[PDB]
Amino acid sequence: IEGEVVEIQIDRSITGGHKQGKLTIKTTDMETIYELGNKMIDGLTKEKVLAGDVISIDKASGKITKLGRSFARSRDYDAMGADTRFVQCPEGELQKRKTVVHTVSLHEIDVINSRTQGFLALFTGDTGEIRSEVR
Amino acid sequence: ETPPIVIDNGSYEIKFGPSTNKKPFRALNALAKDKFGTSYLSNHIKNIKDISSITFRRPHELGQLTLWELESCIWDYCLFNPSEFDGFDLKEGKGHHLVASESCMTLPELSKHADQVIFEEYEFDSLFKSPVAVFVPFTSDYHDFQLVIDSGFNCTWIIPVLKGIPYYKAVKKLDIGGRFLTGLLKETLSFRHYNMMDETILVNNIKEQCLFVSPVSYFDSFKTKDKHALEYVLPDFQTSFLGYVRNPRKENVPLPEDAQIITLTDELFTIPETFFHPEISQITKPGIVEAILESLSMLPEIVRPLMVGNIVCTGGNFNLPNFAQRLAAELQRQLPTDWTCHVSVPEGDCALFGWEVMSQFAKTDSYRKARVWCTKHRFGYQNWI
């Protein structure tokens, strides 16, 4: 789920419930509002997310993709000083499930499986005689 | 005459007939106050050709049965007419026995007045009345401990029974019943279509013939609605008064009867879901499962698993398909693994099942014990607490 936001609501723990949260998200076509998920307050507070940016959330992963700031009207967004690479025009509809095609080779898979952090070994070349049963 | 007349006082239909035939007869208990200038008896409503103009006053209301004049007229039209109902003849009934069925929530004043009405107008020498759950033990040979659900036309009831005797201390009621499916069904049809007025049998027969009860939850029903749809044709009131069932794979009749094909994909499942999650229908009803668990909680732990071990169903709410497996799955949940529950609900038909049960009860010694203060120790339920 992507779309331009306006502000971010992150509340504290109170008597009634866990927290308070109501994100209004805008796009080119239609703008709506959603609510937090307890963990999402921590996820949004991990980084200093500025109010009014195009950030995409995959609920299957929960990874914030701060691609750029909210385009909306560029009269207030005409002198960023570079940054965000000419932001991005919002696409409108929000509920989208797009497949991701990833191309990998057998070496990457076995190197990843071999060690605790196989990607670092892949990027450094210290694999050291990978065992055959893994292969 | 030892074999009595098996009278089953029901809000929708009152069963009757002798205690010998294997097939009970049908007679709707309602008045068709037709606006076009005619009025019909209890068996002259199914032969009328105009339905878009009617407003009935049923004797049975949310509380109790009210219009005694209509009930008496239906009684004297039913028993004193042997041509309409073959094999049903009785002039006075001085020596004839009688069996009557009524709700457990009957007030003492109603019990006294009704029993006196029987004793004075019909002069039955002996009679016996009890709620439908009390007939379950009669099915020693007669049973002792069962749990009975009475999904009545007015209100659904929960009856714990021990020693063949109801336990009225933990009796629970839930108004969700007949009377209601047609309610949200008609409301949804009016919301998704045009406005229809002055009709009370279209939605009822629609529920009776082309609905079922929520395969396991709301989810299966609300996506499988499209593939398992059925386009019931609304009978246009300009020429027609009764409709028929159509399905996109087993079309009974494909001709447009006065056009106007209604696509019943959505709202096929609302009422079949109000029995457990009324919050979907924006109503604060508990549900049958919450009521039964509350009644069991009030029941002592010594007797709790025994009642859930033998579950039976009474009433016509179970006539529609897809009812036994859902309730079985539900009672499978809630109850922990320590206590195991067995499903022994009647196979659909229950009004006839209760008729057969009371027919059997008329042939045993149970009827000869509490047969005629009359509404106190024989028809009275205080001695059975």
């Binding site: - | 002792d144 401990f145 010594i302 698993p305 071990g309 033998n310 320590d338």
Partner: protein, 98 residues
């Protein structure tokens, strides 16, 4: 994700079978080892596994392996609570013997 999904199916705990023994060195002696491995094998559990088999027999006499629950045990709930304990504890003591 595509790999660490069958660990809930085909995982086998070699540690459960005591096949990681090399890491379990610096905490044990043998004077308890042989004594317990014999005593708990025969004399400590002869009075337990046989008692729990007797509770199996007690369940059988209780109600037909729960067959006569609604007809015989209908009016008695204490025997119900005995029957819930018997088979559970005998299975747990079988686990204890393994």
């Amino acid at each position: 994700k595509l790999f660490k999904k069958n660990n809930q199916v085909n995982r086998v705990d070699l540690d459960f079978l005591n096949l990681v023994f090399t890491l379990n060195d610096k905490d044990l002696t043998s004077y308890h080892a042989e004594e317990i491995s014999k005593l708990t094998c025969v004399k400590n559990f002869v009075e337990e596994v046989n008692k729990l088999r007797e509770t199996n027999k007690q369940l059988q006499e209780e109600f037909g392996e729960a067959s006569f629950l609604n007809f015989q045990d209908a009016n008695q709930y204490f025997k119900y609570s005995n029957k819930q304990k018997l088979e559970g504890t005998v299975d747990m003591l079988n686990f204890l013997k393994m």
